[PDB]
Amino acid sequence: SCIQFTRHASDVLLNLNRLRSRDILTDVVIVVSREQFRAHKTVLMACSGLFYSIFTDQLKCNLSVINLDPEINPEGFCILLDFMYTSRLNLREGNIMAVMATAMYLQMEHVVDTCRKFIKASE
Amino acid sequence: SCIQFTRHASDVLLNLNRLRSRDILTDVVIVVSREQFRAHKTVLMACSGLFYSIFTDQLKCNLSVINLDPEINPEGFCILLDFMYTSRLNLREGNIMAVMATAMYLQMEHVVDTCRKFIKASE
Amino acid sequence: AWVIP
Amino acid sequence: AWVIP
Ligand SMILES: Cn1c(=O)n(C)c2cc(Nc3cc(SCc4ccccc4)ncn3)ccc21
Ligand SMILES: Cn1c(=O)n(C)c2cc(Nc3cc(SCc4ccccc4)ncn3)ccc21
After folding, report:
1. Which of A19, A30, B82, B97 has the smallest C-beta neighbourhood within 10 Å, fewest atoms?
2. Backbone phi, then psi, for B27, in 5-degree steps?
3. Closest to A48 in 3D by CA, of A108, A111, A89
């Protein structure tokens, strides 16, 4: 018998992104070569199969710093982190290969899917 | 130049609710008289002006237990916590006054608004 | 907003 | 789903 507020999920996500912008309650630093990204573990887990596996591990759930594979592109990671917090993916000709490789590593299936479709359209 | 995944915000919220159901990364217990509710501080802050004020406070942000006012109804709080994590509000004739009073206390303006409209329709 | 889901 | 926002 529930009623539903249509905009609630997007309002929550917008407020989580505002917390991230203000560095409020951020609890992990993701390191991607020379770059560092502060984030909330729960948002990362909710968006990525890799982070879900990492933060449900009984030892890794306690870490405040996670180092990604050195082959991961920081700009690709930055674009995906923004997508996690906003539903918007800044996909461009100059970044699509790095975004797709990063989404494959992070296990973000819907992003891998749109990248594959955009690449197929150019060939 | 971004593209947007329509279902992303609702998928994130669904995954945050799955973490709550499995007690994964929950970092606060909200006590409402004799009842206890485990939750994620960031989701509570994103949904409630009261929790935003509490967890942005330099002392209270560190607390693992928050006690609400003894006048707050636990069922009303439970209904609102479910709404935070799902966008669905289980509003019924038998709970509407408690839900509205709890939403006023938690500073959840859209919920207070729908409660006021449902009460006005019955008079 | 509010709707019947 | 993907759209132009
Ligand atoms: C593969 N994959 C993605 O493409 N994304 C966006 C993912 C997001 C998640 N995050 C979840 C899933 C679940 S229960 C579902 C589940 C759990 C483990 C494995 C597979 C499926 N609870 C909370 N957070 C997990 C995997 C994802
Ligand atoms: C009054 N009120 C509500 O009805 N809800 C659903 C609220 C949710 C929030 N959570 C926010 C807001 C912001 S910035 C906006 C802001 C901040 C403080 C005061 C007022 C407004 N960043 C992250 N989480 C705050 C107040 C809320």
Report:
1. B97
2. -130, 10
3. A108
* Resolution to 1 decimal place, in Å: 1.5
Give buried/exposed letters for A64-74 (b at 16+ CB in 10 A, else e): eebebeeebbb
Contact yes or no for D3 and B4 at CB 8 A: yes
Query: What number of helices (H) and strands (E) belong to chain A?
Result: 6, 5
How many other CB atoms are found less than 10 A from the CB of residue A31? 14
d(CA A103, CA A116): 11
Rounded to a whole number of angstroms, the distance from the CA of B94 to the nearest CA of chain D is: 39
Q: How was this structure determined?
A: X-ray
DSSP 8-state symbol, B61: G
Chain-chain contact of A114 with D2 (C-beta, under 8 angstroms) = yes
- Note whether A114 and A104 are within 8 A (CB): no
Question: Considering all CA atoms of chain B, what is the largest pairwise distance in Å, rounded to the nearest integer?
Answer: 52
> Which value, to the nearest 10 degrees, does the dihedral of the CA atoms of residues B111, B115, B121, C2 take?
20
